[PDB]
């Protein structure tokens, strides 16, 4: 159930990170062109933080992004309730 | 219960802020290298604001970050419901 949420999310993060670097290489001046940095990107999106150090410049890139938000937000919204309950039910 | 949420959060903020400045000093050009400024960082993350003035450049830094998001979001999601109920139950 919750390990499902975590995993799905971790999949979404690794999925986006893969696809974004894929989606972004080729474009002169693309920043988002190494999985390692594509990963920090992919987290900082799903959390709806939005620091801005990184992002996609390409269309296909932002399409990736949207998915990453859409599945990554929800799936992070799962682990965020999950640990909200585990603090509640206890205390 | 709610003082638990607040506290836990305040712990998470002070935890991250400590660890990030720790995690970030050593790296030339690191911005996030004084607890005072590491604190504003640590808030602005947990809230999922993401202004971007500050952030980690190091790996270990962003690992800190992730935790700070993951525990800081949830624990801020607690105090955000908490004051959502206290407006509801009253009016």
């Amino acid at each position: 159930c919750a390990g499902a949420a975590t995993v799905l999310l971790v999949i979404v993060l690794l999925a986006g990170s893969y696809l974004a670097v894929l989606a972004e290489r080729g474009a002169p001046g693309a920043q988002l062109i190494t999985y390692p940095r594509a990963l920090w990107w992919s987290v900082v999106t799903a959390t709806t933080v939005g620091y801005g150090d990184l992002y996609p410049v390409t269309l296909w890139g932002r399409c990736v992004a949207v998915v990453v938000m859409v599945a990554g937000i929800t799936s992070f919204g799962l682990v965020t309730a999950a640990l909200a309950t585990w603090f509640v039910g206890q205390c | 219960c709610a003082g638990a949420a607040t506290v836990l959060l305040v712990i998470v903020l002070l935890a991250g802020s400590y660890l990030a400045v720790l995690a970030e000093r050593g790296a030339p050009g690191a911005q996030l290298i004084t607890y005072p400024r590491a604190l504003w960082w640590s808030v602005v993350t947990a809230t999922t604001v993401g202004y971007g003035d500050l952030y980690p450049v190091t790996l270990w830094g962003r690992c800190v970050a992730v935790v700070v998001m993951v525990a800081g979001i949830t624990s801020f999601g607690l105090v955000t419901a908490a004051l959502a109920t206290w407006f509801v139950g009253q009016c």
Partner: antibody
Amino acid sequence: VQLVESGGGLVQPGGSLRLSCAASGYTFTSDWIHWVRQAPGKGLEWIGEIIPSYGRANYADSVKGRFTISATSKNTAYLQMNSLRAEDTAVYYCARERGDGYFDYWGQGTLVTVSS
Amino acid sequence: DIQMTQSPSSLSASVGDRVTITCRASQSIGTDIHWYQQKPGKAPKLLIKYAESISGVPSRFSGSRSGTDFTLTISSLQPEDFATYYCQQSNRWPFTFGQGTKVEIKR
């Protein structure tokens, strides 16, 4: 984990040639092979990358749509070489890069010479 | 495009001496520059990543500094170190190399 590079010797200006980089090592799903060139007495020049996985191949302005990079069965990537100028006279190393952005391993590299 | 500018092209430094090799990126590139030794006729060999040492690379070999100034440094130049030394961006697409710095050994 080393890189084995076939093909390439002499071609006519405007002619063709196909270079070869066979895997021969523990080779992950998600590796780019790259193509770097060295003119005679000259620097390195990045030219092209490809992920054999989704088979998407990116190229330098230098090389624009003159060259093609081809991808998994033989665990090989290839450097199709159309519209050759005198300039492309050079050695051509392939190289693995694990998405991290530096070249861990490097094919022996061949010489492509371009003269009438 | 991103313009790695190594310094100096040539060195004639005596053995065991302190050799240093500079590489100015046109813009801030993070720590996303990687060093490479390339011996005459042979393939580039990677000495430094994120100016972080590689397994088997000798201890003479270190690479630091930021802003736009990356600095590969030979603590005690050795006879086996006559090579040309290359500089590689990662930060922006595409990847670029520096001009290159030849070291020659004095004896």
